[PDB]
Amino acid sequence: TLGEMNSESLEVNYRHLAESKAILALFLAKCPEEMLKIFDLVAMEATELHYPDYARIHSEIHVRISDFPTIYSLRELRESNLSSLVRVTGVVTRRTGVFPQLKYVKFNCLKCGSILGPFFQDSNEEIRISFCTNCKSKGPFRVNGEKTVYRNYQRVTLQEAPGTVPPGRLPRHR
Amino acid sequence: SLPAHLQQTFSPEEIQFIVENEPIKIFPRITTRQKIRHTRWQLITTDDKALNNMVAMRSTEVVLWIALLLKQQSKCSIVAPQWLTTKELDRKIQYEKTHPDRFSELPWNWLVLARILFNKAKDDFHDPIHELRGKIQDLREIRQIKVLKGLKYLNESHLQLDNLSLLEINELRPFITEIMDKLREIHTASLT
Amino acid sequence: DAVFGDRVRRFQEFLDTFTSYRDSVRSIQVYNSNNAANYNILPHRIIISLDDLREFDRSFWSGILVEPAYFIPPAEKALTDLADSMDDVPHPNASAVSSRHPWKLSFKGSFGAHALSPRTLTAQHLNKLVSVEGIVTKTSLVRPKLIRSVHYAAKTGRFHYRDYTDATTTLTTRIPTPAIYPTEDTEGNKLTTEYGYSTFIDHQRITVQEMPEMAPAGQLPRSIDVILDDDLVDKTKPGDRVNVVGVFKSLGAGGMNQSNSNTLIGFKTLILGNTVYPLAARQMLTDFDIRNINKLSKKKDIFDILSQSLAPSIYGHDHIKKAILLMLMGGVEKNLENGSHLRGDINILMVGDPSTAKSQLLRFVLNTASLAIATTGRGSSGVGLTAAVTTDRETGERRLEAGAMVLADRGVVCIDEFDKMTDVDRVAIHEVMEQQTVTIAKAGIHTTLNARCSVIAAANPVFGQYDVNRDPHQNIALPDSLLSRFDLLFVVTDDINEIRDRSISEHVLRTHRYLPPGYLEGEPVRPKLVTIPFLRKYVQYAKERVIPQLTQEAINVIVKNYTDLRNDPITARTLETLIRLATAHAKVRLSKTVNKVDAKVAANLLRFALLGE
Amino acid sequence: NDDDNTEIIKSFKNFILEFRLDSQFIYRDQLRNNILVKNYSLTVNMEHLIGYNEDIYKKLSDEPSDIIPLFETAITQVAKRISILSRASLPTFQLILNSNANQIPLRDLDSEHVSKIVRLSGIIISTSVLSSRATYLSIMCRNCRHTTSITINNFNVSLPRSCLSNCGPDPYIIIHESSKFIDQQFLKLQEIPELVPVGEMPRNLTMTCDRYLTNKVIPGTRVTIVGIYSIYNSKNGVAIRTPYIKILGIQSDVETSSIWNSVTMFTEEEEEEFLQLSRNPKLYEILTNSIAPSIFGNEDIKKAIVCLLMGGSKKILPDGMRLRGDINVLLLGDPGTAKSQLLKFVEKVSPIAVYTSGKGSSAAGLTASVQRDPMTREFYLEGGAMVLADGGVVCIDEFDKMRDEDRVAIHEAMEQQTISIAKAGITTVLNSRT
Amino acid sequence: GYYDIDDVLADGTEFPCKFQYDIPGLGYLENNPGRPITKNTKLSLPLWLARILAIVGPVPFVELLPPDMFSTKVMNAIKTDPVALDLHSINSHFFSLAIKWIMLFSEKELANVVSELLLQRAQELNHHASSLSITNIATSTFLLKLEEMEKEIYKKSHESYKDTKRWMFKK
Ligand SMILES: Nc1ncnc2c1ncn2[C@@H]1O[C@H](COP(=O)(O)OP(=O)(O)O)[C@@H](O)[C@H]1O
Ligand SMILES: Nc1ncnc2c1ncn2[C@@H]1O[C@H](COP(=O)(O)OP(=O)(O)O)[C@@H](O)[C@H]1O
Ligand SMILES: [Zn+2]
Ligand SMILES: [Zn+2]
């Protein structure tokens, strides 16, 4: 049913990882980014085992992890939940438009013939270019059209739901 | 009695008729020649001696409506003239690009005959039809540029061209004649 | 340059061919010398006709109308040389020697395709001389701009001058000067700036918006910003139907800098205004027009002729059109010694049934007045009628822009649907009707603004149709205090008839059967009666020329009529209202005295306005 | 790389010079007839370019922004070959594409279609003022006083840092006397309401036009647009570069004659067919049956609708008396008489038409509104529903329910055909012939 | 020509003129029932009266004043830009009236002006007539600015070019 309408999302129930291979669920709960970085390649290989030459339709596959057993509201988020998966209930108040974002940023050094290597974007802060691979100093950098990859980007202001907040209090915004 | 669009000018199909009434070299594919051992042709507006002496796979000279009528039968194949080659058309293009003030020494029936042989003789050209029609269009465009340049000299007295085609005379006839007629009317009203 | 000098001698040959410009320069110089040195100053500008230069040199005419940056400064240099050679003055002033404005060029004549509009100003007309027509809007404040600084060195005792160039001042592009005064000289040691010998010009930005009658379907009017040179500063007020001739120029980096790598913004485009034409609100009066005006003033029924000459398409409302005529030529204003401001501007409120052509009379007095501003009940705000405080772009300073009711000063305000103002707008309107000045105290600004303007307004009753029950409260929904300031409360009833209704029907079918002259039949549009420009000339002549004064033979009639009208909705103000009629009819007769025939007509018109006659 | 660029230029030159369908060089004749009316543009069908050479089709459709200027150079070279005699001027041209591709909706426009030619459809809601972009720049060095030239193509460059004769760090200024400029009009596109996704809002997308594509659409029309989906950086988080569409082609059957000039742009055989329709003895019943074929009865309403669509004649008198050339029709009656369906069909049939509510209306919404520009902090008038319907039809649903202050802002706009607004220091009389 | 209907509408235009004699009984010229005409009366009359009323009369009956269509403003506008001038708003049959005015008053400068104008608009007329679509705004706005004889010449040239286009381009 991923292949049926050319979808790119493969939903995985976390309870299925709880029943079998709970070490994998623990690794996903503790280090989610690297676990999903392995999991998308695993799901792409599992798709190509059943749908060969599916990479022409969608070059990268993505996995939506479903039903995390711990639900944290916006008031209950603390420092221990950083770099981890959180399940947050809230209402969306402000939604920006669709924006193209460079999945891999690469730049051309003007003074040197060498080009700067493609770096993956984390969608939090821009990649800090301290120097170049041939010259150890800052220079003019602009995006080459040799290898460019664009992905969709959209921020939403997830306000806490007013039935979820304590009565009369203020909502929280993330 | 005469229609308004045929009043002071010729229609292009009348120009087609006029250039259908010329001789042209041709290759017969039938033998009408009497041997030493068939109604005759017997025409009254052209010499029928070349048509009575029609020999297969030879060069004869017949009128162009007979040429098209027999090409429709495919009993006789029309030979293109000397100026319908790529080399001669390139020479004419070079003469047009060499002298800007003077038109090239093309025949009077160079657009009408080319259209007739393009729409009726698609397998009778030694050169390819493709670059032939390209050079025809190039000559037409550069002659259009030259007549646009020469139309700035619309004089009250007279105006001369050297080798403009009959189809280009019907291109430019009503505009030039009406504008010069009104210029002459203005100056003759200006006379005391 | 060599080509610069060649165009200099070409324009010198042109000025030698036509000696009228030399005579005008000589007249300007001798007028300045007579009115300045000896016991209101003509500036440095000449009226260049493009047509007179077209038969001289078509190359120079095409250079002016196509690439004016290389053709107008050589003509400036040639005209400056001719003005220097023509001037022969002994013992000049040091400020006169150091600060000389070059003789600028002002252009007249036919332009052809270059005579344009602010909507159709496009990128192919940049760096070309164009003539545009439109509404003046958003006049920036007059502020001086330095173009030459003169400094004195005392250790050497020498005066050093430095020229200062801007993108807007010079048609050609020069390297910009950062406007820093020279602190010290390279050889003269310390330098002291000498203001007074330095040269400053007045700088002003206006905004020419497209004339709204020429707007196409579905599009808002466009606008341009026009720089005004120091001779042309303060020639234009907002709401003026100006014709500006100037060089349509673009300036600035405009996003071509390295910071703006992929910003799709365009270049900032302006017009360096060579000349400004009013386009004749105060029409000039030839002597033949004066002869016609004084010939028709002697007729006994000139009031009737000029009344039915107003809007022949409108049938009926003859006394209303008489009041409209006395409204356009409003009465004399008297300012007393103690300071009481006695209003000479008659104001008219027309209340009544729908389709009695009150708004059509509003449109007619909009078109035929010297200055007219319209407004609507639901399309007006009280701040938007008087004045609004906003920042200015070139100054970074807060200032007022006048609203509808102030910009129509010495003019008329055409209020439609007056019965349905918001109360905030009613406060401001009532303030003008009782005070004629508005006091603005906000944004750190304490200012008073004069508004000596007339008001004609149209209204419906509080019901759907006007009642014949003569109820005082159901005439208007506005309070009676605002009713009191209106001098003539005309009420109209569309009573249903047969004969007069057939007359109005045949009149409007004769109105619809008109075909405008010079236009094809069935195509889309792209007992003496005087013409409407002649009527406007009559109104202008009566307004500026004659000031009538009041005389007893009207006065006994006026006091008898007031006692008859009041003692047998009446106000003491009605007395002043009779004066606001009576001398107004004197302005019809053009005499400087008021007689009995003005007062009888005034009493008849006010009896028609109040009682209905 | 310049060898491949001039090979592309020569190949598209050969495409213009050598294309012939049914014994006719369509593109050379198109260029000649476009030059003769001083319309320096060339309209190219994509089917014709594919039928010539599909390799050229991938060269166009792969990186369009780097090859469309090469095609522009090829068109200008063909134009100088055609209309200029050698050894005895013309500015840059414009390539306008026509495509018959399936229309990509606005919500499906995403990061996959970046720098690709897409064909879409939408509703114009705002056309901005024309801005003067530059093509030829005479760049002057401030120190050594030498003048170079920079040629600007409006795809995907700035002032360089060396003077190309220390001379100076940034020694360049721009001479505006010898610079050539083209137009650029900004547009805002709203998507088709029939193709909006479920539960969302129509997304406005900013678009641009250059040269002769400017001033072609009135706001409110429904248009199909072909163009490249490029990205430009905006002055307003991380790596957010706002998308836009550079328009290569505009098509609209509902919209005619660009900004209205009372101009006859209908073709000759369509004009003869229209004359035949005007000569029909029973065209009145044809126009009556054309209005609401799925509504029984209401024949007099259909006749009044046809009279509304044709309208009267606007007349001008020498005394300034302007009389109305439009008729306003109010359908008052019971529910279930299909009045709102007649309103919807009138909005469909009319070329300029808007459909509004009584509850969803406002005084500044139907008439023109006074809004504030964000950057300049200056008030400006933005047109409402009776400005977008100027020269056409406004339709009001539930007229009985619109507010008493809201009904009476329409009186001058119905009768005087104008809106006189004096608010916020701006006073004007806009024309609204609705 | 007698039967030229364009010439008939050309003669139907009214020109301003001055009456030289005190002529009673012609009050129907200025739509009055019976007013005798005073000395030096300024009045607009059609050309079929005033063309030979200025001939017969020595002092003739009617003096032809210079109208607005031949004023110095119109002459300067023609001399500046002949192509984009809107001749239709001035007069729909400006050229036939110009020819009649030149034949009546032999003015050489007006002859040079109208000849130069006719040449410059004939170039643009030929440019719009040779263009065949496979209508533009740039051609149809010039058709909006054309006279009746000029659109007659454009119709002749345009149908000639279109007919030879369909002859050359198809059977
Ligand atoms: N001669 C006339 N007599 C009466 N009414 C007329 C005449 N000529 C025009 N009208 C009508 O007067 C109407 C304008 O009045 P209206 O718009 O009702 O004023 P307001 O907007 O102040 O109520 C026009 O619709 C026009 O049809
Ligand atoms: N004559 C008819 N033909 C077809 N449908 C009709 C007809 N009359 C009513 N209807 C249907 O009934 C509904 C009537 O709605 P309508 O009367 O337009 O709403 P409103 O009362 O707001 O005007 C429509 O949806 C329409 O489909
Ligand atoms: Zn480097
Ligand atoms: Zn340098």
From Swiss-Prot, chain C:
Protein name according to UniProt: DNA replication licensing factor MCM3
Keyword flag Nucleotide-binding: yes
GO cellular component annotations of the record: chromosome, telomeric region; CMG complex; cytoplasm; DNA replication preinitiation complex; MCM complex; nuclear pre-replicative complex; nuclear replication fork; nucleoplasm
Further details from the record: Present with 35100 molecules/cell in log phase SD medium. Early fractionation of eukaryotic MCM proteins yielded a variety of dimeric, trimeric and tetrameric complexes with unclear biological significance. The MCM2-7 hexamer is the proposed physiological active complex.
GO MF, any single term: ATP binding
GO biological process: DNA replication initiation; DNA strand elongation involved in DNA replication; double-strand break repair via break-induced replication; mitotic DNA replication initiation; pre-replicative complex assembly involved in nuclear cell cycle DNA replication; premeiotic DNA replication; silent mating-type cassette heterochromatin formation; subtelomeric heterochromatin formation
Annotated effect of mutating K358A: No effect on MCM2-7 complex helicase activity. Loss of MCM2-7 complex helicase activity. Reduces MCM2-7 complex helicase activity
Motif Arginine finger location, chain numbering: 484-487
Record: residues binding ATP: G352, D353, P354, S355, T356, A357, K358, S359
Span of the entire protein shown here: 18 to 740 of 971
UniProtKB keywords: ATP-binding, DNA replication, DNA-binding, Helicase, Hydrolase, Nucleotide-binding, Nucleus, Phosphoprotein
Residue stretches making up the MCM domain: 302-509
Family membership: Belongs to the MCM family.
Group of enzyme by EC: hydrolase
Complexes and interactors: Component of the MCM2-7 complex. The complex forms a toroidal hexameric ring with the proposed subunit order MCM2-MCM6-MCM4-MCM7-MCM3-MCM5; loaded onto DNA, forms a head-head double hexamer. Interacts with CSM1.
Subcellular location: Nucleus
EC number(s) per entry: 3.6.4.12
Keyword Transmembrane: no
UniProtKB/Swiss-Prot annotation, chain D:
Compartments reported by the entry: Nucleus
GO terms under cellular component: chromosome, telomeric region; CMG complex; cytoplasm; DNA replication preinitiation complex; MCM complex; nuclear pre-replicative complex; nuclear replication fork; nucleoplasm
EC number, UniProt record: 3.6.4.12
Keyword list, A-Z: ATP-binding, Cell cycle, DNA replication, DNA-binding, Helicase, Hydrolase, Nucleotide-binding, Nucleus
MCM domain mapped to chain residues: 283-434
Statement: the UniProt record of this protein carries the keyword tRNA-binding: no
Catalytic activity: ATP + H2O = ADP + phosphate + H(+)
Keyword Repeat appears in the UniProt entry: no
Sites where the protein binds ATP: G333, D334, P335, G336, T337, A338, K339, S340
Segments passing through the bilayer: none
EC category name: hydrolase
Molecular-function annotations in GO: ATP binding; ATP hydrolysis activity; chromatin binding; DNA replication origin binding; helicase activity
GO biological process, one term: transcription elongation by RNA polymerase II
Domain of life of the native organism: Eukaryota
Family stated for the protein in its record: Belongs to the MCM family.
Additional remark text: Present with 10300 molecules/cell in log phase SD medium.
Entry function: Acts as a component of the MCM2-7 complex (MCM complex) which is the putative replicative helicase essential for 'once per cell cycle' DNA replication initiation and elongation in eukaryotic cells. The active ATPase sites in the MCM2-7 ring are formed through the interaction surfaces of two neighboring subunits such that a critical structure of a conserved arginine finger motif is provided in trans relative to the ATP-binding site of the Walker A box of the adjacent subunit.
Subunit structure: Component of the MCM2-7 complex. The complex forms a toroidal hexameric ring with the proposed subunit order MCM2-MCM6-MCM4-MCM7-MCM3-MCM5; loaded onto DNA, forms a head-head double hexamer. Interacts with CSM1.
The protein's name in its UniProt record: Minichromosome maintenance protein 5
Organism of this sequence: Saccharomyces cerevisiae (strain ATCC 204508 / S288c) (Baker's yeast)
GN (gene name): MCM5
Section covered of the full-length record: 20 to 517 of 775
Swiss-Prot record, chain E:
Residues annotated as signal peptide: none
Keywords: DNA replication, Nucleus
Gene3D superfamilies, A to Z: 1.20.58.2050
A Pfam family reported for this protein in Swiss-Prot or TrEMBL: Sld5
GO biological processes: DNA-templated DNA replication; double-strand break repair via break-induced replication; mitotic DNA replication initiation
Any single Gene Ontology cellular-component annotation: DNA replication preinitiation complex
CDD domains tied to this protein: GINS_A_psf3 (cd11713), GINS_B_Psf3 (cd21693)
Compartments in which it is found: Nucleus
Entry-linked InterPro entries: GINS_A, GINS_bundle-like_dom_sf, GINS_Psf3, GINS_Psf3_sf, PSF3_N
Family: Belongs to the GINS3/PSF3 family.
PANTHER family (alphabetical): DNA REPLICATION COMPLEX GINS PROTEIN PSF3
Subunit structure, as described in the record: Component of the GINS complex which is a heterotetramer of SLD5, PSF1, PSF2 and PSF3.
Miscellaneous comment text of the record: Present with 2205 molecules/cell in log phase SD medium.
Function of the molecule: Functions as part of the GINS complex which plays an essential role in the initiation of DNA replication by binding to DNA replication origins and facilitating the assembly of the DNA replication machinery.
Protein name: DNA replication complex GINS protein PSF3
Species in which this protein is naturally found: Saccharomyces cerevisiae (strain ATCC 204508 / S288c)
